[PDB]
Amino acid sequence: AMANIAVQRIKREFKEVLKSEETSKNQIKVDLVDENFTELRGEIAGPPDTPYEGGRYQLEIKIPETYPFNPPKVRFITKIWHPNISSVTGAICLDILKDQWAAAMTLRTVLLSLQALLAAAEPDDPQDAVVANQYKQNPEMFKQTARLWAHVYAGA
């Protein structure tokens, strides 16, 4: 097992996700992978009124031994076309997953923050340059491409 603080935090946070209004709306979900709690599987719904609407995105979530004092490591398993996520690896550019993690944050707020990122790209500080360039230079074709990928990869 992990340290008591980490185990108790993760169990509490799993309960929080289960009991949340957002899971009742089918917006977020977290499931077990191990017999332990070092890897979890997240899922988020594409926010409404975005190219990701209708899609569901699986997330690889790795909990460090130092939880809650360092962030989970999170990657998109489900491929997505977004300026702040690698279209190749699913790697995520988001401050709360690096220098702006706070110990008060939770699995629930991480999932909800990732949804919010889907609704509010920051192309000037990108993860994927090709995607970010298209977002800026041809937003109509960015939208068509992201929608297509939501159908192709995310069940939209």
From Swiss-Prot:
Keyword Cell division recorded: no
The protein, known as: Ubiquitin-conjugating enzyme E2 K
Phosphoprotein among keywords: yes
Span of the entire protein shown here: 1 to 155 of 200
GO biological process: protein K48-linked ubiquitination; protein polyubiquitination
Cross-link named Glycyl lysine isopeptide (Lys-Gly) (interchain with G-Cter in SUMO1), sites: 15
Modified residues (N6-acetyllysine): 15
Lineage of the organism: Eukaryota, Metazoa, Chordata, Craniata, Vertebrata
Catalytic residue list: 93 (glycyl thioester intermediate)
